[PDB]
């Protein structure tokens, strides 16, 4: 029986427009929805419903079965009080401490509990048509839908029960539920871990078709990423400039990094390739700085009232550096990402994975997905993001334009 | 005849109520038609008189169709529309003719007096209450309310398309072969039957519709549809008439550019760079704006294109979709979408809006993207591109470019002009080359600056500058350097601005200076730039 859902007052339902899809994807969405209609999960609606939320078609991990993916980012914002306060889900600040964290897809659970009849109208979605030749099939949800944060919020109760008999047996495995996924952590050994997960999978399945699936993470390896200076044997005027260049940039983050000591080696208009001797009277700065750069700065506390921001830089050669932060130059974390150079992998496919990577590291660490500053063209991303997308959630993003030394820095 | 179809439940916005707007008593000659027409509409059931106490009213007016003698009633519903909830936007965005699949026969049916033949949700009928006056302010009793979708009401278009979609379904089942596409009030029926077999189905539908209360008529292929002259196997845009004038206002150049753009989707080579560069200034309509030599030469080039007529072919989901791009002038591009050699599905152009020092490799990419979105919208798939660029050329730039990108399938097409990478910078300093420590600056007040350099070989220069920005100077420095240098140079600038503008390797930004620096880099064999914290 329904669990009254209200929109944050002074706010109306979502009215986001459907993006245009390839005939291929339209086709899959049609079959899926026709089935969901049969099973009563959704129903057709009329013009008396001004609401709308986007829908894509993705391929689940490892299968050639198409999956529907409703982008509820807007409805989520318009119901935030419901799933963040009224029914919040506390996040385990130690799940990041475990040695191995597997991710399970439980979204299929929600299709059980029916949705508040008065809220339904807000889940309206539209399967588009090509070239506009037709109106668009319109459906609204009748059960909790996946992608809608209100869904795990309402279902917690039923989740908390089905999981009780397991949390008692293995009081050391940590379980976090975000969106349609379960993040199970443990200090076991890879061999056992996979066993405990299969234990959990079967447990879940006995207590009601709660059928999941599998994603291997390792928080205990997610260590820092101190910047690196390139120490050489010889040093030209240029190298020293570039060195002074990165050093005078690092000073927006690190305190004790001074360079006026090294600036005295470029003294008065000298050739560029001219090797410069290594003055010891200065090295008490380079050496001093090579260290200040290995262990992080004071402060830098995760403000939970603020938003998480993730910037990514194209490092070229299938490599991408990234940093999550809330207030410029106080990164809470920074990493890298590498592709697998053959039979596929283009910038777009990589970025898409790097984003998915960063988002999961985020959920696990802060129980919160960040907002990305994607170095790509809005329309290009809007075109292909949906091709290499596996996640069942979608973060917020925006597109940036040209990093001065911010890339040459994190290299 | 009001249809037996189900009605759609309507409601007024959350805390509102119906229009109480009082009727303006006027001409009794009008009050003549209001009763004459309401009378007929009351019989047909479109309307009904209601109990004295309906707290609402919407002004009624009366307009004579000059040419016929038959007055037409008009109800300005705008006040109700403000109080009526929102509906699923009558899905706008008219299909592009280049995407429709060709058929042997296509008929159009005017479902005009349609929406008036559709029942309106019961409980919402009262808010549609109007009041026909009388001989003279004494007998107000003439009060009705609609039972069908009132012209001009807010939710009429929405509830009609809906109702129509439902009405056609039982018919589309019995006829899976044909395809029907409803639009505002004009039905489209196409098939691959036979001219006479196709004539039996069209009359079948009419009866079907009629059995639904909707009435239909008892033009030809060369159709009227929204700017598109249609044909038995082709399409084009309604003929165009580009103005000839001695004086032009903002409002005239706008209608010109608009008309010219509309042509683009079929007329190859259309340009607007200059004609629209004119509106750069403030939108102050009817502001007579002088022409220009370029703009005048341009308007001409279009006229010569529009000379002859251009026709478009339809879609064949059987063949591939190919798109080819041609770089025209600097900053402009054109492309054609086709399935068969020279006989386009559709055409169009692209241009660098900001143009802030860009790259031909990058613009060509912006076009491929621009075409990919369009193709998906129209054909539900992307095309195979044919491009004036060398795979190696492209890879070189994408692999070294900071932004991520990705072009669909594309083969090379050696057809000058090819795509440019006129000059490349040195990734490492150049040994044995003179090093210039350029730089400059201007006074934010005086508008005066100095641009020079100091070489390692002791040589130095400093040129005086007037009406210059601290960014104009920084580029004047780099320019000087390239001028007073050999064939290989090492330049060291304090300006990230200038550094980056050059690293993006632009071209002929018709910014004389930036075009001069560029011409200089081309001449050099090896240039190496480098930046150092300002000051
Ligand atoms: C595709 C085709 N083959 C034809 C062959 N002979 C004559 C006309 C032909 N058409 C044709 C004619 C007119 C129109 C325009 N058109 C109408 O008016 S009503 C309508 C609804 C949806 C989309 C388009 C449309 C679209 C296609």
Swiss-Prot record, chain B:
Site feature: Essential for RT p66/p51 heterodimerization: 397, 410
Substitution effect: residue 398 to L: No effect on RT p66/p51 heterodimerization
Domain of life assignment: Viruses
Listed result of changing residue 189 to M: 27% increase of DNA-directed DNA polymerase activity. 10% loss of RNA-directed DNA polymerase activity
Consequence recorded when altering residue 497 to A/G/H/L/S/Q: Complete loss of RNAase H activity
Effect listed in the UniProt record for changing residue 52 to G: 74% loss of polymerase activity. 86% loss of RNase H activity
Consequence when changing residue 184 to V: 58% loss of polymerase activity. No loss of RNase H activity
Domain Reverse transcriptase: 44-230
Resulting phenotype, residue 65 to R: 10-fold decreased sensitivity to ddATP and ddCTP inhibitors
Outcome of substituting residue 229 to A: Complete loss of RNA-dependent DNA polymerase activity. Complete loss of RNA 5'-end and 3'-end cleavages
Subcellular location(s) of the protein: Virion
Positions of the UniProt region annotated as RT 'primer grip': 223-231
Outcome reported for the amino acid change (mutating residue 167 to A): 71% loss of DNA-directed DNA polymerase activity. 61% loss of RNA-directed DNA polymerase activity
Documented effect of changing residue 184 to L: 90% loss of polymerase activity. No loss of RNase H activity
Impact after mutating residue 187 to I: 29% loss of DNA-directed DNA polymerase activity. 46% loss of RNA-directed DNA polymerase activity
Oligomer status and interactors: Heterodimer of p66 RT and p51 RT (RT p66/p51). Heterodimerization of RT is essential for DNA polymerase activity. The overall folding of the subdomains is similar in p66 RT and p51 RT but the spatial arrangements of the subdomains are dramatically different.
Function: Multifunctional enzyme that converts the viral RNA genome into dsDNA in the cytoplasm, shortly after virus entry into the cell. This enzyme displays a DNA polymerase activity that can copy either DNA or RNA templates, and a ribonuclease H (RNase H) activity that cleaves the RNA strand of RNA-DNA heteroduplexes in a partially processive 3' to 5' endonucleasic mode. Conversion of viral genomic RNA into dsDNA requires many steps. A tRNA(3)-Lys binds to the primer-binding site (PBS) situated at the 5'-end of the viral RNA.
Protein name: Reverse transcriptase/ribonuclease H
Organism of derivation: Human immunodeficiency virus type 1 group M subtype B (isolate BH10)
Gene from which the chain derives: gag-pol
């Amino acid at each position: 029986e329904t669990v009254p859902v209200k929109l944050k007052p002074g706010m109306d339902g979502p009215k986001v427009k459907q993006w245009p899809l390839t005939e291929e994807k339209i086709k899959a969405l049609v079959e899926i929805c026709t089935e969901m209609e049969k099973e009563g999960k959704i129903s057709k609606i009329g013009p008396e419903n001004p609401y709308n939320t986007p829908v894509f078609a993705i391929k689940k991990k490892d299968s050639t079965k198409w999956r529907k993916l409703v982008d509820f980012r807007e409805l989520n914002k318009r119901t935030q009080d419901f799933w963040e306060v009224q029914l919040g889900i506390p996040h385990p600040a130690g799940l990041k401490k475990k040695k191995s964290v597997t991710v399970l897809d439980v979204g299929d659970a929600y299709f059980s509990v029916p949705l508040d009849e008065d809220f339904r109208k807000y889940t309206a979605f539209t399967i588009p048509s090509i070239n506009n030749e037709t109106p668009g099939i319109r459906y609204q949800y009748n059960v909790l839908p996946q992608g809608w944060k209100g869904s795990p919020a309402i279902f917690q109760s039923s989740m908390t029960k089905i999981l009780e008999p397991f949390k008692k047996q293995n009081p050391d495995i940590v379980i976090y539920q975000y969106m349609d996924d379960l993040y199970v952590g443990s200090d076991l050994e890879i061999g056992q871990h996979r066993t405990k997960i299969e234990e959990l999978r079967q447990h879940l399945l006995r207590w009601g078709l709660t059928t999941p699936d599998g994603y291997e993470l390792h928080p205990d390896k997610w260590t820092v990423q101190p910047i690196v200076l390139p120490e050489k044997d010889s040093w030209t005027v240029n190298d020293i400039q570039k060195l002074v260049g990165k050093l005078n940039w690092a000073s927006q983050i690190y305190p004790g990094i001074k360079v006026r000591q090294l600036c005295k080696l470029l003294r008065g208009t000298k050739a560029l390739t001219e090797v410069i001797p290594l003055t010891e009277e200065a090295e008490l700065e380079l050496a001093e700085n090579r260290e200040i750069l290995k262990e992080p700065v004071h402060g830098v506390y995760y403000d939970p009232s603020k938003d998480l921001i993730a910037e990514i830089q194209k490092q070229g050669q299938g490599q991408w550096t990234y940093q999550i932060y809330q207030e410029p130059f106080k990164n809470l974390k920074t990493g890298k990402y590498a592709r697998m150079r053959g039979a596929h992998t283009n910038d777009v496919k990589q970025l898409t994975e790097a984003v998915q990577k960063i988002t999961t590291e985020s959920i696990v660490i802060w129980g919160k997905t960040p907002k990305f500053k994607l170095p790509i063209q809005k329309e290009t991303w809007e075109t292909w993001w949906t091709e290499y997308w596996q996640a069942t959630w979608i973060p917020e993003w925006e597109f940036v334009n040209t990093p001065p030394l911010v890339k040459l820095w994190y290299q | 005849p009001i249809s037996p179809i189900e009605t759609v439940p309507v409601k007024l916005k959350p805390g509102m109520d119906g229009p109480k707007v009082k009727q303006w008593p006027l001409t009794e000659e009008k009050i003549k038609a209001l009763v004459e027409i309401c009378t007929e509409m009351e019989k047909e059931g479109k309307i009904s008189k209601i109990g004295p106490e309906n707290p609402y009213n919407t002004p009624v007016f009366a307009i004579k169709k000059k040419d016929s003698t038959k007055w037409r009633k008009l109800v300005d519903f705008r006040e109700l529309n403000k109080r009526t909830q929102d509906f699923w936007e009558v899905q706008l965005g008219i299909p592009h003719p280049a995407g429709l699949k060709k058929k042997k026969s296509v008929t159009v049916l005017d479902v005009g007096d349609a929406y008036f033949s559709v029942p309106l949700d019961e409980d919402f009928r009262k808010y549609t209450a109007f009041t026909i006056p009388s001989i003279n302010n004494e007998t107000p009793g003439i009060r009705y309310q609609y039972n069908v979708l009132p012209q001009g009401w807010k939710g009429s278009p929405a509830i009609f398309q809906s109702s129509m979609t439902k009405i056609l379904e039982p018919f589309k089942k019995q006829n899976p072969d044909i395809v029907i596409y409803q639009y505002m009030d004009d039905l489209y029926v196409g098939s691959d039957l036979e001219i006479g077999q196709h004539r039996t189905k069209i009359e079948e539908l009419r009866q079907h519709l009629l059995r639904w209360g909707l009435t239909t008529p008892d033009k030809e292929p060369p159709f009227l549809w929204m700017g598109y002259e249609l044909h038995p196997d082709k399409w084009t845009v309604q003929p165009i008439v580009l103005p000839e004038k001695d004086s032009w206002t903002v409002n005239d150049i706008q209608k010109l550019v608009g008309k010219l753009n509309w042509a683009s989707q079929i007329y190859p080579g259309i340009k607007v760079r200059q004609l629209c560069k004119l509106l750069r200034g403030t939108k102050a309509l009817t502001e007579v704006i002088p022409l220009t030599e370029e703009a005048e030469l341009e308007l001409a080039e279009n006229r010569e294109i529009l000379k002859e007529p251009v026709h478009g072919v339809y879609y064949d989901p059987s063949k591939d979709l190919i798109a080819e791009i041609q770089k025209q002038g600097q900053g402009q591009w054109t492309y054609q979408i086709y399935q068969e050699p020279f006989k386009n599905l559709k055409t169009g152009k692209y241009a660098r809006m900001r143009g802030a020092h860009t790259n031909d490799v990058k613009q060509l990419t912006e076009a491929v993207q621009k075409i990919t979105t369009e193709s998906i919208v129209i054909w539900g798939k992307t095309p195979k591109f044919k491009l004036p660029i060398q795979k190696e050329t492209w890879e070189t730039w994408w692999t070294e470019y900071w932004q991520a990108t990705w072009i669909p399938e594309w083969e090379f097409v050696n057809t000058p002009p090819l795509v440019k990478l006129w000059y490349q910078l040195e990734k490492e300093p150049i040994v044995g080359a003179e090093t210039f420590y350029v730089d400059g600056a201007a006074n934010r007040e005086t508008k005066l600056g100095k641009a020079g350099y100091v070489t390692n070989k002791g040589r130095q220069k400093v040129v005086p500058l007037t009406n210059t920005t601290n960014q104009k100077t920084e580029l004047q420095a780099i320019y000087l350097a390239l001028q007073d240098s050999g064939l290989e140079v090492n330049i060291v600038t304090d300006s990230q601005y200038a550094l980056g503008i050059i690293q993006a390797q632009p071209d002929k930004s018709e910014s004389e200076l930036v075009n001069q620096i560029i011409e200089q880099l081309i001449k050099k064999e090896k240039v190496y730039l480098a930046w150092v914290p300002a000051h």
